[PDB]
Write a protein that binds this ligand. Structure first.
Ligand SMILES: [Zn+2]
Lengths: 244, 73, 133
């Protein structure tokens, strides 16, 4: 069928009160919910690796990718904190630590952070040099970049940056930090793998700059927008520093 | 009452308003969750109304009751 | 026509064939009579044509999963009162063809399949042994 069979797998996220089984034990209601969330995430990040799923979820109609972005712009701190994990592992980005300050979660996503493989017993120097030192290829295609660029373009077309901005401003701090870091990672990926026409107007961020410069809205939104811009600049500096 | 021509006119407006497309996020979520069963149930009801046979209405009512029990929780 | 008659007429009062979709093909035994020269089915002991369609309509109603306890109890009482109505293989063929074309739940399906468990089906075995040698 058209829009009712494959789009069922993202019902646990789009339906705030989702009941999968008609008759289940009333004792387990939160563990069942977490299991549903985990299975739906594992299915959603598995349909975006195939072309028949990418094309069928991003159809120009009332697709299932716009219903996934639209529920991200609703202040529900349970679905909103679970969609960010799917967005993080769709783009193969590392998750920061669960904190409320940006300067602590920015340190956990450092490309040069210590790993267990770099110990003398495991991988002393050879494994460490692989992570921090770059590959010798400067013109190889690297199909991974092709796939990530296609996915990022498909997500930007359906208004992902506006949803991320709305999550950054009108939400809690635990989720604001994670959405700011995701926005920084996506903005860095844009100016690296996207063609110039696709990424020459993304760095303007109109919906966030017009909020950080409007003195008619309440002052809390303006100040948190300015703080988000400052954190984005800090993330860009961290990215242009490099792994040490 | 064994009134099939009553339940038909009771639940036909629902299928009618459901085939004009969901317009909100709640309606889209409902169409993603329960939308598949409510189409095969209508297909079975139509197959029954074409050729009268309770063997075709029993499956439609199976689907309807499953959807009802999932909604009522 | 019987499904509407059973609404107002009870079982004990009506006591004072029934296979709808039964043909030579799609029957466990009847298919053999022409191909393998099976001897025709024997005459059972109108006293049994009624219980046949009764158990058929019961197993049909058991498919909607609306009220399974009542129909399960009815089937249990029919098995208790007349343990010989579950012996004709031309009824097991019909209920299996019905299981193969409807949506039964797993416990209801297991119960239906288990109703016909402690059965003998002696005539088919005898005819198979006769056509063998
Ligand atoms: Zn037969």
């Amino acid at each position: 069928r058209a829009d009712v069979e494959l789009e069922r797998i993202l019902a646990p996220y789009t339906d705030f009160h989702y009941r999968h089984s008609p008759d289940t034990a009333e004792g387990q209601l939160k563990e069942d919910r977490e299991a549903r969330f985990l299975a739906s995430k594992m299915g959603i990040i598995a349909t975006f690796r195939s072309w028949a799923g990418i094309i069928n979820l991003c159809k120009p109609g009332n697709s299932g990718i716009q219903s996934l972005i639209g529920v991200l712009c609703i202040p529900n701190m349970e679905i909103r904190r679970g969609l960010l994990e799917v967005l993080y592992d769709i783009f193969r980005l590392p998750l920061p630590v669960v904190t409320e300050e940006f300067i602590e979660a920015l340190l956990s996503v450092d490309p040069g952070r210590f790993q267990d493989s770099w110990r003398l017993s495991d991988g002393f120097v050879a494994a460490e040099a692989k992570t921090i030192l770059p590959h010798r290829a400067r013109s190889r295609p690297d199909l991974m970049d092709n796939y990530l660029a296609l996915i990022l373009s498909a997500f930007i077309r359906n208004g992902l940056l506006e949803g991320l901005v709305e999550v950054i401003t009108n939400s809690d701090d635990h989720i604001s930090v994670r959405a700011t870091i995701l926005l920084g990672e996506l903005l860095h990926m844009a100016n690296t793998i996207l063609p110039h026409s696709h990424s020459h107007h993304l760095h303007c961020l109109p919906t966030l700059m017009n909020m950080a410069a409007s003195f008619d809205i309440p002052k809390e939104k303006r100040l948190r927008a300015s703080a988000a811009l400052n954190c984005l600049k800090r993330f860009h500096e961290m990215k242009k520093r490099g792994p040490k | 009452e064994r009134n099939v021509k009553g339940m038909f006119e009771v639940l036909e407006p629902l299928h009618a308003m459901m085939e004009r497309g969901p317009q909100t996020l709640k309606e889209t979520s409902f169409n993603q969750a329960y939308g598949r069963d409510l189409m095969e149930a209508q297909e079975w009801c139509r197959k029954y109304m074409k050729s009268g046979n309770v063997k075709d209405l029993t499956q439609a009512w199976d689907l309807y009751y499953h959807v009802f029990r999932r909604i009522s929780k | 026509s019987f499904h509407l008659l059973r609404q107002q007429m009870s079982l004990t009062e009506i006591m004072n064939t029934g296979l709808q979709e039964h043909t030579d093909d799609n029957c466990l035994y009847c298919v053999c009579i022409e191909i393998l020269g099976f001897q025709p089915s024997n005459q059972l002991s109108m006293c049994r044509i009624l219980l046949r369609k009764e158990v058929l309509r019961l197993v049909i109603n058991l498919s909607s999963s609306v009220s399974t306890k009542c129909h399960e109890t009815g089937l249990l009482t029919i098995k208790e009162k007349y343990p010989q109505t579950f012996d004709d293989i031309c009824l097991y063929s019909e209920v299996s063809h019905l299981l193969s074309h409807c949506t039964f739940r797993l416990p209801c399906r297991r119960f239906i399949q288990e109703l016909f468990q402690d059965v003998q089906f002696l005539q088919m075995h005898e005819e198979a042994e006769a056509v063998l040698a």
